[PDB]
Amino acid sequence: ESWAQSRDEQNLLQQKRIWESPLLLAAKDNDVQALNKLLKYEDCKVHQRGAMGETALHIAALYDNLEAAMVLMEAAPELVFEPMTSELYEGQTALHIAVVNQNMNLVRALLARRASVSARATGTAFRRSPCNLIYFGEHPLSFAACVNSEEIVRLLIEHGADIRAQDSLGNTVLHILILQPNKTFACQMYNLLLSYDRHGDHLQPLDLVPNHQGLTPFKLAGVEGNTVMFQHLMQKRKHTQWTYGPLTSTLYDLTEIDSSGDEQSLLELIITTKKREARQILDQTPVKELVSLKWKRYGRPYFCMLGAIYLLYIICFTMCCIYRPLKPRTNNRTSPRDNTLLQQKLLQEAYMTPKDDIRLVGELVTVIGAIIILLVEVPDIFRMGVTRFFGQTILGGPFHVLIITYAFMVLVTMVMRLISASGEVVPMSFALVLGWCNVMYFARGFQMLGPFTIMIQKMIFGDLMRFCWLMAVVILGFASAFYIIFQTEDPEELGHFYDYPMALFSTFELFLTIIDGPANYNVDLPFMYSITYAAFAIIATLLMLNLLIAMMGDTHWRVAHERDELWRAQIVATTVMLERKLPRCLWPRSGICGREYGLGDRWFLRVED
Amino acid sequence: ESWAQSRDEQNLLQQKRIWESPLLLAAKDNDVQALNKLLKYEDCKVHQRGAMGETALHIAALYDNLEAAMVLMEAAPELVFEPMTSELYEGQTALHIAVVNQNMNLVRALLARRASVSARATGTAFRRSPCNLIYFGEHPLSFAACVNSEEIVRLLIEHGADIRAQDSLGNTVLHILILQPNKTFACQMYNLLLSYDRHGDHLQPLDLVPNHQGLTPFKLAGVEGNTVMFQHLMQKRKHTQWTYGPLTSTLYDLTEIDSSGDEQSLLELIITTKKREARQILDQTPVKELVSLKWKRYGRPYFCMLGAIYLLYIICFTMCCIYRPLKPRTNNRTSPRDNTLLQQKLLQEAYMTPKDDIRLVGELVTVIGAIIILLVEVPDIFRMGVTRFFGQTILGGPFHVLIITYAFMVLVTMVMRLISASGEVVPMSFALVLGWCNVMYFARGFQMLGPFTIMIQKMIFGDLMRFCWLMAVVILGFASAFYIIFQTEDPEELGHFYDYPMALFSTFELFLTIIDGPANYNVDLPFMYSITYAAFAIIATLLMLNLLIAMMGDTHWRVAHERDELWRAQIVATTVMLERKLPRCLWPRSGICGREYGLGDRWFLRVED
Ligand SMILES: CCCCCCCC/C=C/CCCCCCCC(=O)O[C@@H](COC(=O)CCCCCCCCCCCCCCC)COP(=O)([O-])OCC[N+](C)(C)C
Ligand SMILES: CCCCCCCC/C=C/CCCCCCCC(=O)O[C@@H](COC(=O)CCCCCCCCCCCCCCC)COP(=O)([O-])OCC[N+](C)(C)C
Ligand SMILES: CCCCCCCC/C=C/CCCCCCCC(=O)O[C@@H](COC(=O)CCCCCCCCCCCCCCC)COP(=O)([O-])OCC[N+](C)(C)C
Ligand SMILES: CCCCCCCC/C=C/CCCCCCCC(=O)O[C@@H](COC(=O)CCCCCCCCCCCCCCC)COP(=O)([O-])OCC[N+](C)(C)C
Ligand SMILES: CCCCCCCC/C=C\CCCCCCCC(=O)O[C@@H](COC(=O)CCCCCCCCCCCCCCC)COP(=O)([O-])OCC[N+](C)(C)C
Ligand SMILES: CCCCCCCC/C=C\CCCCCCCC(=O)O[C@@H](COC(=O)CCCCCCCCCCCCCCC)COP(=O)([O-])OCC[N+](C)(C)C
Ligand SMILES: CC(C)CCC[C@@H](C)[C@H]1CC[C@H]2[C@@H]3CC=C4C[C@@H](OC(=O)CCC(=O)O)CC[C@]4(C)[C@H]3CC[C@]12C
Ligand SMILES: CC(C)CCC[C@@H](C)[C@H]1CC[C@H]2[C@@H]3CC=C4C[C@@H](OC(=O)CCC(=O)O)CC[C@]4(C)[C@H]3CC[C@]12C
Ligand SMILES: CC(C)CCC[C@@H](C)[C@H]1CC[C@H]2[C@@H]3CC=C4C[C@@H](OC(=O)CCC(=O)O)CC[C@]4(C)[C@H]3CC[C@]12C
Ligand SMILES: CC(C)CCC[C@@H](C)[C@H]1CC[C@H]2[C@@H]3CC=C4C[C@@H](OC(=O)CCC(=O)O)CC[C@]4(C)[C@H]3CC[C@]12C
Ligand SMILES: CC(C)CCC[C@@H](C)[C@H]1CC[C@H]2[C@@H]3CC=C4C[C@@H](OC(=O)CCC(=O)O)CC[C@]4(C)[C@H]3CC[C@]12C
Ligand SMILES: CC(C)CCC[C@@H](C)[C@H]1CC[C@H]2[C@@H]3CC=C4C[C@@H](OC(=O)CCC(=O)O)CC[C@]4(C)[C@H]3CC[C@]12C
Ligand SMILES: [Ca+2]
């Protein structure tokens, strides 16, 4: 907060550092006559700095003043070069300011006195960060491209500029147009600026030059959701084979869209980026067909063979828990509240029959399966993000967490079976619930179950969790009242609130109306019970019918319009994942390779519409 | 009703008092020739009054008649001055009527005979009240401004008018334009009328002059929801620091918008006014940023430290009720329906162990907390509205009532503990429910829980209370039938309706289907039970599914479009409250103060867009 407070103070401190001098006053407004009196009488020094360490020329450019600064140059011609020596607008010179305010006559007077066009505004007000409402780059070519000024673009190339110049982020000027809020004007700048390569000794095209994330402008249009620069960039990568009346056969280049090894690709970048406007690109004319190609041919068959193996694995795990080793209890019961008949066997006792060795096969299969789950999910964070970049992906998939939590609870049950620890029902019951509810992951490989299963996630991490805080508040208040109302009664005749953890659990069940809840009719209940439970029942059904509301504004007004789009993005995230963690010989590469067609070492996709 | 009946009779009695005289007849229509016969033959008196005590001239102005009234002035020149001597349009003269009907030639003939322009229509038809469909003021400048007549505005300033003149409410003419139903025409009158200050010896600007509620025109635009006069008035309070291409840095005056001590402010006026169109102003360009400033920096941290203290306080209170002093009962049970095992200890017995003194700390903390709740909420009605202005604020907050009802029930439990009164479970159970459901107040300081918690209030004081009247009717009829059906049976085999208060409570539970309800299958139930309960079950599920309807027209068609707006208004109401009841040294004032920037003793807000 203090940096935005410091930035708010520097703009006000700038407006005060003008008013206490005449030499910086005649170069703010159009008062040229006093400035001729300021120079010849006392012969004062003219390099007086303002708040940002700048000369009076930067105030002239920021308010469009040309006339007094001529006498500044007939007397002190060296004024052109000196940039801002500040720390917020650092390295910004007078040329940058006249570019974004689009002054043209100042360029003809500066450059006649050998001005500078390769200056780099590296200050913090020009960087790519959400505090700054503009991002233009660092160079004066970059600024004129972004305020949509064709004249200043050609006026710099005449004066020794450079279009292959980059930011500290590595963005060239072609990258920066893709980042602009005004999309259609960026398309015209892109065609204007790309048309100045004109050098064969240099090998790199300007639209192939990557920034420091290794992204081209084409891939930067994909990551940012710039769909009209995506379609515009796609004509460099089309080829029209033939036109047959209403038909045409278009061949798509597919080189930077599909994966080519260790280099990151457009399909994987759209999924693994934090931006949501990138998912509109997943419906475009080389990409929508590419995704439907590899899902219908290789993705969906493998995802169904993976879900048929997983289903048999959990059915095998379920039988090992149903047949877990149990024996009659040894000590006698300690109290009439003791319900236990059976306890689990020791390791020396639990494998002593042919019926046990059928279970040992399934137990070893279960253990082997949990290790293979931890060998393909846990080694993919130590080269990846340890808890950060894996932690970002959790909103895309909770089933990563669920299948590791399953495999954790299997191996805890293994350890407790090895050391004869008591309480194997605790890790098993988590594992039965975790392992079976992971079958819902494979719902995304079906037309019927895919868009319904996404609705489940967005209501548990939205409106269900939202309801649970308000539910916990009501439960805690009424369970405490129900506890102290029945605290003086006999629990043998009404035991719902006999101690305080049972009173919490009973009130929870009463909230959901899943237990019938306290009545005897042979005995006098306290009168406060009938008052409190009537009030509880009105509030609980009010709240329950309110959760039913919020789940209907959640779906039909937020996530029913995007059922297919969120589900098609799940097919892409699955198909990308199911190719990276699968061998090369099982997965043919998508598209048709050249070198048998005179097309190169490229893989091409044909679309006939 | 009788005053609107009296007002309806006076307009009809006015239409009859014309027809019985010739001297008031020739001055209604264009019959000038008979009027020259009415004057010279019998030489009659001309000051004959109508129904509102008015002369015949007011009938001429009300129907645009100029020609006969000239001979009225060549014979009786003193006719100009005499106002209405009525009590509904009191003090209205002929100049007011010709202004609102926009006659111009009558002004040139009256004022040539020294007419009056400082007349005050103080009658009841011109006051600000919902019976009157216009509110124009009292002065003839005020009327011409409101019917949008620029010519008559300049025609009065030439004739000795006064723009600094006020109503009996204290509204100047600039106040009255803000109150008009035609917003855009009021903006042009505002620029026309403000441009006539032109006096340096007088100190007060016309747009700074307050009415009797101490409100400027700027604050009157805030209170009334006049958003286009709010934005128009805001340009007097902006200052553009610089423009950098697409960027500009605007500095907002923020003096009459933020609080300056005991004088009432714009943020607190929007919240504490009864009007709902004022909440649109809470989204405007100096106000939306000011609110998000002090909530994100000071409001939200303090509201979370206040909710973390309150949560620990209620957890401490909950433990004191769970560990309340109880002993085995002394007398024997009086009947087999007596379920009580325990009774509470006396004061001499309830503090006799180290386990009691841990509870005495928590009980004293609970008591001290309830006094501090009553010291910051109850002394704020005796200088405020005792039950009226506090009573108006209840629709904004029920948690005022809930936290005082909590603190009332704590101290009743204190008194009953001090005097060994029996029945402490009655004030405690209210206090556990009231104290825990007050945690839902702190839901408004979160993005997730804020708009959901407002939905709860608007359905309990709307559709739930609406359903409860219809529910009580059905419950009362069927409980009485269920009572008399089972009135001849043995309640040992079916006890749901054994007496009439249990029959009411059972039918309530049966309505909500939260108890399973009567079946035995070993015994013959009355045949009327199966008829009545089938009819009850159809009606109860019909009604329950109808409550589910009404809660979906309530939200998605009334209060889902305004979830963020009702929740942002709750942030303003919380931030205003949490600054007034909090010290000065903990709360830095919002904005940047001048006097180190040449800007005055004002606090300014900078907005860069
Ligand atoms: C996203 C989902 C939301 C989850 C919310 C979390 C809710 C879940 C919380 C669960 C807490 C469960 C533990 C309580 C019981 C422990 C067992 C025990 O022995 O206690 C004992 C008493 O102990 C107490 O009195 C503790 C209760 C005090 C108030 C609890 C509030 C704190 C929870 C923080 C929640 C704040 C969150 C509010 C949210 C805004 C029981 O007594 P006894 O042994 O039976 O008899 C004593 C005998 N004698 C008295 C006759 C001598
Ligand atoms: C979401 C909506 C929330 C609603 C909030 C709920 C409102 C809550 C307000 C409750 C106020 C009730 C006062 C309680 C104080 C009783 C003290 C007393 O002396 O009583 C005595 C008689 O008891 C009776 O016979 C009277 C029963 C209570 C009165 C009617 C309450 C029903 C509310 C109807 C209107 C409903 C309107 C609601 C509209 C919706 C009991 O004393 P005792 O016999 O000596 O005890 C010994 C027996 N023992 C040993 C077994 C212990
Ligand atoms: C916003 C929320 C809505 C709230 C609505 C309020 C509803 C809540 C109302 C609650 C009233 C509760 C009190 C009744 C029972 C008292 C106990 C008692 O002793 O009574 C006794 C009889 O007494 C009666 O018969 C009274 C019943 C007559 C009709 C009740 C309607 C009046 C309620 C006004 C409602 C109109 C509102 C309608 C709305 C349009 C019980 O008899 P017994 O002792 O068991 O046995 C006698 C023995 N013997 C016969 C064999 C000899
Ligand atoms: C929201 C919708 C609301 C619906 C309104 C509900 C309609 C209400 C209309 C009800 C009309 C019923 C007539 C009641 C009079 C009976 C008198 C008699 O003599 O019967 C005798 C035989 O009893 C029987 O065996 C016949 C049972 C009733 C007939 C069929 C009723 C079911 C309705 C089907 C159609 C449903 C259509 C509904 C469509 C929806 C009983 O006399 P007893 O044996 O001598 O008694 C001694 C036993 N005791 C000592 C134990 C006491
Ligand atoms: C997709 C849906 C269809 C799929 C088809 C399968 C689903 C449904 C199939 C069968 C279910 C119905 C048959 C009941 C089971 C009885 C088996 C038995 O003989 O019990 C024996 C022990 O039992 C065990 O030891 C098995 C425990 C787990 C082993 C898991 C299989 C391992 C084999 C390798 C597989 C590798 C896994 C592959 C890895 C990827 C003997 O005990 P008993 O005392 O004689 O008990 C019978 C008497 N009683 C009941 C009266 C007490
Ligand atoms: C936010 C969520 C986390 C917060 C953490 C806290 C939440 C959870 C924390 C603890 C809950 C779980 C522990 C159980 C409680 C046992 C304590 C005990 O020793 O009992 C004793 C008496 O007990 C009392 O006297 C306490 C009664 C209320 C005192 C309130 C605290 C005052 C201390 C100052 C605080 C100032 C408050 C601050 C003001 C703003 C001994 O009785 P006993 O007979 O030996 O009982 C045990 C045997 N039995 C059960 C088998 C019968
Ligand atoms: C003795 C043998 C035959 C045991 C059988 C083992 C298989 C049933 C297990 C072993 C490893 C498992 C895989 C390990 C990890 C994953 C990643 C997992 O990814 C997610 O959960 C994605 C998260 C999301 O996006 O929601 C999908 C299932 C899969 C392929 C698992 C499918 C089931 C496998 C093949
Ligand atoms: C032994 C008992 C107490 C188990 C309790 C453990 C819970 C923490 C588990 C049980 C089932 C789990 C759920 C089962 C299924 C899913 C998958 C997923 O839900 C979806 O809708 C899938 C996401 C998608 O479709 O993209 C998000 C997590 C969730 C709700 C799980 C969250 C964790 C849960 C609630
Ligand atoms: C509000 C939403 C988000 C769900 C939270 C509801 C809570 C009130 C639930 C969640 C877990 C429940 C607990 C889960 C396990 C148990 C153990 C259970 O049995 C025992 O403690 C041991 C057996 C005995 O001696 O009775 C008693 C209830 C209790 C504390 C439950 C009390 C009610 C709890 C706290
Ligand atoms: C021994 C000590 C530490 C006991 C602890 C005392 C606090 C937990 C209490 C004492 C006074 C209470 C305050 C008294 C009154 C109010 C006003 C209250 O305002 C409303 O209820 C607004 C109503 C609405 O608009 O809905 C908000 C909570 C607050 C600050 C209370 C918060 C909790 C406080 C600080
Ligand atoms: C022992 C029993 C019989 C007590 C009788 C009634 C109680 C259950 C009290 C304590 C909790 C109270 C509720 C707690 C929260 C609120 C605040 C408010 O609800 C909201 O949605 C908050 C307002 C907002 O968000 O602006 C309206 C009153 C209400 C429902 C209260 C109404 C009265 C209640 C139900
Ligand atoms: C219609 C909506 C708005 C709620 C109102 C429903 C009523 C039918 C409820 C509200 C309060 C209830 C009462 C709350 C307290 C009691 C005390 C309860 O126990 C006793 O009277 C003492 C013990 C005994 O001797 O049985 C019997 C039911 C009764 C009258 C309840 C009967 C049903 C009532 C009137
Ligand atoms: Ca039941």
Question: Mind giving me the DSSP string for B92-110?
Answer: --HHHHHHHTT--HHHHHH
Distance separating alpha carbons of residues B415 and A352, to the nearest angstrom: 70
Way the structure was solved: cryo-EM
Query: With a 6 A CB cut-off, is A469 part of the ligand 1 pocket?
Result: yes
Q: Which residues have C-beta within 8 Å of that of residue A445, sequence separation ≥ 6?
A: A299, A300, A303, A304, A307, A574
Chain B's closest residue to A557, CA to CA, is: B556
Most A-contacting residue of B432, B467, B497 (CB-CB within 10 A), to test interface: B432
Q: Does A465 touch chain B (CB under 8 A)?
A: yes
**Amino acid identity, residue B66?**
L
Count of CB atoms situated within 10 Å of the CB of B288: 14
B190 CA distance to ligand 3 middle (Å): 65
Chain A's closest residue to B459, CA to CA, is: A542
Q: Are A474 and A565 in contact (CB under 8 A)?
A: no
Rounded to the nearest 10°, the torsion over CA A563, A567, A569, A570 is: 150
SS3 A243: strand
DSSP codes joined into one string, A309-367:
HHHHHHHHHHHHHHT--EEE-SSPPSSTT----EEEPPTTTSS-SHHHHHHHHHHHHHH
| Among A352, A355, A371, residue to substitute to test ligand 5 (most atoms within 8 Å of Cβ) | A355
At residue A395's C-alpha, the angle toward residues A392 and A396, to 5°, is: 100
- CA-nearest of B86, B60, B84, B61 to B7 is B86
Q: Does A478 touch chain B (CB under 8 A)?
A: yes
Of all helices (H) and strands (E), which one includes residue A476?
A: helix A465-485
Of all helices (H) and strands (E), which one includes residue B244?
A: strand B238-244
- In a 13 Å sphere around the CA of A571, the CA atoms on its Cβ side amount to 29
- In a 13 Å sphere around the CA of B381, the CA atoms on its Cβ side amount to 16
Sign of the four-CA dihedral B572, B574, B580, B584: negative
Q: How far is residue B297 from each of residues A326, B301, B589, measured CA to CA in Å? A: 60, 7, 11
- CA-nearest of B509, B587, B499, B511 to B544 is B511
Contact B505 A62 (CB under 8 A): no
- Considering only the beta carbons, identify the residue of A473, A546, A557 that sits closest to B440: A473
Distance separating alpha carbons of residues B83 and A562, to the nearest angstrom: 71
Residue B195, both tokens:
């441009």
**Amino acid identity, residue A304?**
C
Residue A499 among known ligand-binding residues: no
Chain B hits for A557, Cβ within 8 Å: 556, 560
> What is the position in ligand 11's atom list of the atom closest to the CA of B396?
26
Task: Specify the residue with its C-alpha closest to ligand 7, atom 16.
Answer: A373
Distance separating alpha carbons of residues B368 and A40, to the nearest angstrom: 79
- CA-nearest of A292, A175, A178 to A230 is A178
Task: Specify the residue with its C-alpha closest to ligand 4, atom 49.
Answer: B526
Distance separating alpha carbons of residues A60 and A97, to the nearest angstrom: 9
Count of CB atoms situated within 10 Å of the CB of A359: 19
Chain B hits for A532, Cβ within 8 Å: 429, 433
- Considering only the beta carbons, identify the residue of B433, B548, B555 that sits closest to A481: B433
Query: With a 6 A CB cut-off, is A306 part of the ligand 7 pocket?
Result: yes
Annotated binding site of B for Ca(2+): 516
Of all helices (H) and strands (E), which one includes residue B603?
A: strand B603-608
B174 CA distance to ligand 6 middle (Å): 65
Count of CB atoms situated within 10 Å of the CB of B337: 12
Q: What are phi and psi of A152, to 5 degrees?
A: -75, -25
Q: What are phi and psi of A518, to 5 degrees?
A: -55, 120
Q: How many residues does chain B have?
A: 609
Q: How far is CA B560 from the centre of its chain?
A: 21
Chain B hits for A84, Cβ within 8 Å: none
Touching B: A residues 400-459, CB under 8 Å: none
Chain B hits for A473, Cβ within 8 Å: 436-437, 439-440
Q: Each residue of B79-100: b (16+ CB within 10 Å) or e? A: bbebbbebebbbbbbbbbbbbb
Q: What are phi and psi of A592, to 5 degrees?
A: -110, 125
Helix axes A33-40, A68-75, angle to 10 degrees: 20
Of all helices (H) and strands (E), which one includes residue A592?
A: strand A592-593
Resolution of the determined structure in angstroms stands at 2.4
Distance separating alpha carbons of residues B92 and B54, to the nearest angstrom: 9
Distance separating alpha carbons of residues B91 and B110, to the nearest angstrom: 17
Touching A: B residues 325-344, CB under 8 Å: 326, 336-344
Q: Give the residues across from A244 on adjacent strands.
A: A247
Task: Specify the residue with its C-alpha closest to ligand 1, atom 32.
Answer: B315
Annotated binding site of B: 516
Q: Which CATH superfamily is domain A1-251 in?
A: Ankyrin repeat-containing domain (1.25.40.20)
Q: Does B545 touch chain A (CB under 8 A)?
A: no
Distance separating alpha carbons of residues A453 and A555, to the nearest angstrom: 12
Q: Does B513 touch chain A (CB under 8 A)?
A: yes
Query: With a 6 A CB cut-off, is B460 part of the ligand 3 pocket?
Result: no
Query: With a 6 A CB cut-off, is B315 part of the ligand 1 pocket?
Result: yes
Q: Each residue of A360-388: b (16+ CB within 10 Å) or e? A: eebbeebbebbeebbeebeeebeeeeeee
Chain A hits for B434, Cβ within 8 Å: 477
Q: Are B369 and B352 in contact (CB under 8 A)?
A: no
Query: With a 6 A CB cut-off, is A460 part of the ligand 9 pocket?
Result: no
Rounded to the nearest 10°, the torsion over CA B298, B303, B304, B308 is: 140
Q: Ligand 12 — pocket residues by CB below 6 A?
A: A 524, 527, 530-531, 534; B 468, 471-472, 475, 501-502, 504-505, 508
A566 CB burial (10 A radius; 0-12, 13-18, 19+): middle
Q: How many residues does chain A have?
A: 609
Q: Does B609 touch chain A (CB under 8 A)?
A: yes
Chain B hits for A459, Cβ within 8 Å: none
Q: How far is residue A32 from each of residues A98, B543, B600, measured CA to CA in Å? A: 20, 84, 30
Long-range Cβ contact pairs of B229-234 (< 8 A, separation 24 or more) = B229/B177, B229/B178, B229/B183, B229/B186, B229/B187, B229/B190, B230/B281, B230/B284, B231/B284, B231/B285, B232/B187, B232/B190, B233/B207, B234/B284, B234/B285, B234/B286
Query: With a 6 A CB cut-off, is B273 part of the ligand 1 pocket?
Result: no
| Among A504, A512, A543, residue to substitute to test ligand 9 (most atoms within 8 Å of Cβ) | A504
Q: Are A450 and A295 in contact (CB under 8 A)?
A: no
